[PDB]
């Protein structure tokens, strides 16, 4: 999308994969705020917002929290408390066309500075003089939007940068968006410290004949202690028994 018509998509009710974005590293700009880009995005979120818009290279810093500029105050304003990722990359082959591509617009002037995460699709002729615009293109009345005009042979500062702003809310208790997960291979018939869904315990894991209900993760027998647990990766139910101990 163009910057003025900033398109928003909602990443909801799915396990998120940020490692694939990290290992690819195909994004020249990788600035994450609140959550660090150094493998800290493997976390749980109630709401993940993805927003895409194509800007010129030279003002891709402007769209950072507490920064000011034309794009910042008239097209897309980032909240000063942004706890997300501003990811940017060159799209010169894809988004520059011979003779220029004029499909991407930007609001050079507007009556007032834009509020956080607020859109303006209005085409009302900007006022710059005492004479009313009346919806005509003339002196002291100018169309608010302009074409970037990316050209194939141009500086990267004058070449398009696709930006996919990711807005995280950092709530780990509610957490619709499941985070990326590590993988640890199953080990059986050994006294092992197991951490199943945050539950830490000591004991051996063995094959379990118990049939858990689909909505049940771990089981508790009489006297309220864990007896059988279903691992979430491969939905396998394993019986937990304490490893051997006794007096001497």
């Amino acid at each position, epitope marked *: 999308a163009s910057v003025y018509a900033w398109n928003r998509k909602r990443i909801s009710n799915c396990v998120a994969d940020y490692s694939v974005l990290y290992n690819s590293a195909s994004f020249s700009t990788f600035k994450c705020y609140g959550v660090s880009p150094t493998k800290l995005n493997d976390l749980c979120f109630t709401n993940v917002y993805a927003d895409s818009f194509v800007i010129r290279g030279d003002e891709v810093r402007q769209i950072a929290p507490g920064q000011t500029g034309k794009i910042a105050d008239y097209n897309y304003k980032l909240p000063d408390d942004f706890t997300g990722c501003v990811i940017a990359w060159n799209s010169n082959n894809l988004d520059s066309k011979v003779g220029g591509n004029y499909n991407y617009l930007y609001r050079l002037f507007r009556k007032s500075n834009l509020k956080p995460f607020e859109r303006d699709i209005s085409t009302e002729i900007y006022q710059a003089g005492s004479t009313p615009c009346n919806g005509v293109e*003339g002196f002291n009345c100018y*169309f608010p*939007l302009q*074409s970037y005009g990316f050209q194939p042979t141009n500086g990267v500062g004058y070449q398009p940068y696709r930006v996919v702003v990711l807005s995280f809310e950092l709530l780990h208790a509610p957490a619709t968006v499941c985070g990326p997960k590590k993988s640890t291979n199953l080990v059986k018939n050994k006294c092992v410290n197991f951490n199943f869904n945050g539950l830490t315990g000591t004991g051996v894991l063995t094959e379990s004949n118990k049939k858990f209900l689909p909505f049940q993760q771990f089981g508790r027998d009489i006297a309220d202690t864990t007896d059988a647990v279903r691992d979430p990766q491969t939905l396998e139910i394993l019986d937990i028994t304490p490893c051997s101990f006794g007096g001497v």
Partner: antibody
Amino acid sequence: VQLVQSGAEVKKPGSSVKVSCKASGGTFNTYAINWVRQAPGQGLEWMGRIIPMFGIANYAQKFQGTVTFTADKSTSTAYMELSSLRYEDTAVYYCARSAYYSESSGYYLDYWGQGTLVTVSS
Amino acid sequence: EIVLTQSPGTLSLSPGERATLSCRASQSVSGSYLAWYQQKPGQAPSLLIYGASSRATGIPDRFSGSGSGTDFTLTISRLEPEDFAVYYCQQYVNSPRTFGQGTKLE
């Protein structure tokens, strides 16, 4: 670069007509289209403009309510609809370019179509 | 809305050398938002001079405008036998792009 328009309309008085100025490739992208009424033997009367990309059409006070401007984003063709043929409405309707963007700040008419003359008959 | 009054109404008497084709407006043209045109007989007008003195693509350098404020000149080095087309003024200063009456009408 080329804005070939419609020819001549055999429209009996009171009968509506639609014009067909044809924009070349990339015309609509960065340029608005303007229509000017040229009644045979007078001066040029600016009717209004069509901003094709955003579908914005604004008309002068004189022609408001009497003429309709439409443009087709696909096929890149400019259209003008006349509500009915009033007796004084007979004129050669032209179509012309404009650098409507602020940075260009043109707003003048670069290139023009051949013209579409409406009349009581031929 | 700003009106325009072309003063030399009829200069199609096959003249020569420099001309003084004029236009004047009730309220002064702002920022040289004027456009000269070239309406050849039987054909559509072609842009002649935009701004105040700027040159158009294809147009000879001979055509020029020495105007300011109430922009009023279309100096031409030499009246060509073919170049007797009625020249039209226009103002785009936040108005409904009104045109003048014409200056070389037979």
